[PDB]
Amino acid sequence: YTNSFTRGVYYPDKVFRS
Amino acid sequence: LFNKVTFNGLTVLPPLLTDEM
Amino acid sequence: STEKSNIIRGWIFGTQSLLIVNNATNVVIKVCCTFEYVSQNLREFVFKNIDGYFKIYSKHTPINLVRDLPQGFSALEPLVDLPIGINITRFQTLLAYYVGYLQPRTFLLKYNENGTITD
Amino acid sequence: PFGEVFNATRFASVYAWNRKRISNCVADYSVLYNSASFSTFKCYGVSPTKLNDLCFTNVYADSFVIRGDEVRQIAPGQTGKIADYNYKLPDDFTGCVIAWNSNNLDSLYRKPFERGYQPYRVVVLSFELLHAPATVCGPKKSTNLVKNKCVNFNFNGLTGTGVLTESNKKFLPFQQFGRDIADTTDAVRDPQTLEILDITPCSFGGVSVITPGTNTSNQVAVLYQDVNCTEV
Amino acid sequence: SSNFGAISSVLNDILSRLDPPEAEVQIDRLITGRLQSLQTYVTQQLIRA
Ligand SMILES: *[C@@H]1O[C@H](CO)[C@@H](O)[C@H](O)[C@H]1NC(C)=O
Numbered sequence: 001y002t003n004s005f006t007r008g009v010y011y012p013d014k015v016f017r018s
Numbered sequence: 019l020f021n022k023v024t025f026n027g028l029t030v031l032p033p034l035l036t037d038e039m
Numbered sequence: 040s041t042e043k044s045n046i047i048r049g050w051i052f053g054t055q056s057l058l059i060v061n062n063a064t065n066v067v068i069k070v071c072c073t074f075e076y077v078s079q080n081l082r083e084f085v086f087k088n089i090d091g092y093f094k095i096y097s098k099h100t101p102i103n104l105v106r107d108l109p110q111g112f113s114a115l116e117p118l119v120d121l122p123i124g125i126n127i128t129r130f131q132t133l134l135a136y137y138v139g140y141l142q143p144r145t146f147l148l149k150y151n152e153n154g155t156i157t158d
Numbered sequence: 159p160f161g162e163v164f165n166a167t168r169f170a171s172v173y174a175w176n177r178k179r180i181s182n183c184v185a186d187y188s189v190l191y192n193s194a195s196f197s198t199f200k201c202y203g204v205s206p207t208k209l210n211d212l213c214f215t216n217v218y219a220d221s222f223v224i225r226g227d228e229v230r231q232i233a234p235g236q237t238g239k240i241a242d243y244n245y246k247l248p249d250d251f252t253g254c255v256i257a258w259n260s261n262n263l264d265s266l267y268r269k270p271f272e273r274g275y276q277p278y279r280v281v282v283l284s285f286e287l288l289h290a291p292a293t294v295c296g297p298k299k300s301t302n303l304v305k306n307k308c309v310n311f312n313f314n315g316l317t318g319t320g321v322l323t324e325s326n327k328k329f330l331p332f333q334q335f336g337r338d339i340a341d342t343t344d345a346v347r348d349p350q351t352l353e354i355l356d357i358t359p360c361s362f363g364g365v366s367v368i369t370p371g372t373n374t375s376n377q378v379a380v381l382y383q384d385v386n387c388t389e390v
Numbered sequence: 391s392s393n394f395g396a397i398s399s400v401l402n403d404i405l406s407r408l409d410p411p412e413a414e415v416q417i418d419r420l421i422t423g424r425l426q427s428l429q430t431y432v433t434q435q436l437i438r439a
Pocket residue numbers: 151152153
């Protein structure tokens with residue numbers, strides 16, 4: 001078993017926020 | 019002292035007495 | 040999958056079967072035919088089906104150590120969305136690979152000036 | 159090719175309703191609305207006139223044959239045996255249900271979107287309102303882009319009035335719209351040139367009148383708040 | 391950005407979709423909610439001031 005840690009975030013939606 | 023302190027229809031109106039005054 | 044050789048080139052999806060094959064050059068995707076999809080270190084892939092749309096997210100990151108997932112933050116850019124509308128309860132991989140199930144969560148996302156999700 | 163769906167020689171069963179997806183084509187809903195053949199043209203979340211100008215990401219057509227009485231059951235948030243199992247409409251599906259008399263030609267039945275006695279063919283249209291490049295667009299004519307001036311802009315079915323300026327935003331390719339804290343869209347990508355344009359609201363300011371007492375004089379001075387003299 | 395019960399929180403959308411008779415209903419919901427939001431804001435400022 002390998003810990004997920006912080007890996008795996010993806011952009012939720014097309015709209016751009018800065 | 020001054021260093022330490024930090025659209026739609028909303029608008030901010032300038033104070034009558036400027037900081038210099 | 041943390042492989043430089045990238046032997047893995049297949050992804051089988053089934054309860055209609057969704058076959059995604061990297062093959063050569065453009066990736067070719069078969070949902071057979073109810074529909075046909077036009078041809079399009081560590082590799083990170085997120086697979087989810089929402090409303091009959093299959094959104095894939097892919098990021099490639101060089102790894103100092105193959106054994107352990109790199110400590111740090113990675114943002115996965117969406118690659119392709121397919122309106123296949125096929126129910127998938129099982130999946131298989133065609134030639135280490137780590138599989139993690141996705142659970143709904145509330146996330147606070149930090150966006151930089153560039154707009155990347157820094158954290 | 160709406161004609162194919164509407165004039166389809168063979169119609170699907172009510173319970174076994176079929177869904178055909180219409181995409182990548184300009185769609186004119188006026189023709190359908192004009193045709194009197196359709197006994198009912200009720201639109202639940204949209205108005206027929208607006209249909210011509212609105213641009214939808216995807217259009218889904220459901221074809222089934224039901225008795226005249228059964229037509230009412232289809233309606234969203236209505237309890238009918240046909241609606242109970244055969245075909246279910248989710249509330250606020252933002253689509254138009256179109257039914258036409260088909261008894262002459264006709265003369266098997268048994269979760270939302272999950273699959274007197276004369277039978278009438280019924281086709282249900284569902285409109286996708288998600289924010290994505292919209293494959294289906296109504297008949298419209300594009301006009302040349304204008305920048306650095308207040309302009310009323312309709313982009314891919316999005317209407318707003320604001321100044322348009324070139325945007326230095328590093329828009330990601332998948333991204334189509336940039337939004338501020340408010341729902342209003344700060345930045346838009348051109349449907350024809352794929353350029354990122356910033357939107358700035360047209361200058362608005364309070365008008366104040368400086369008046370000496372009316373008795374003393376009637377002359378007045380006018381102040382425009384936070385408005386440059388050049389603008390006005 | 392709150393719907394307050396309306397189909398959408400973007401006024402232009404409602405105007406660009408529903409016909410005048412129906413739109414009124416949706417708009418009224420938004421007006422009521424937005425109006426209430428201002429009063430709350432104003433009241434707090436008075437007390438705070
Ligand atoms: C954005 O990316 C550029 C490189 O294109 C980099 O120089 C800059 O520091 C980045 N800014 C942020 C806020 O990430």
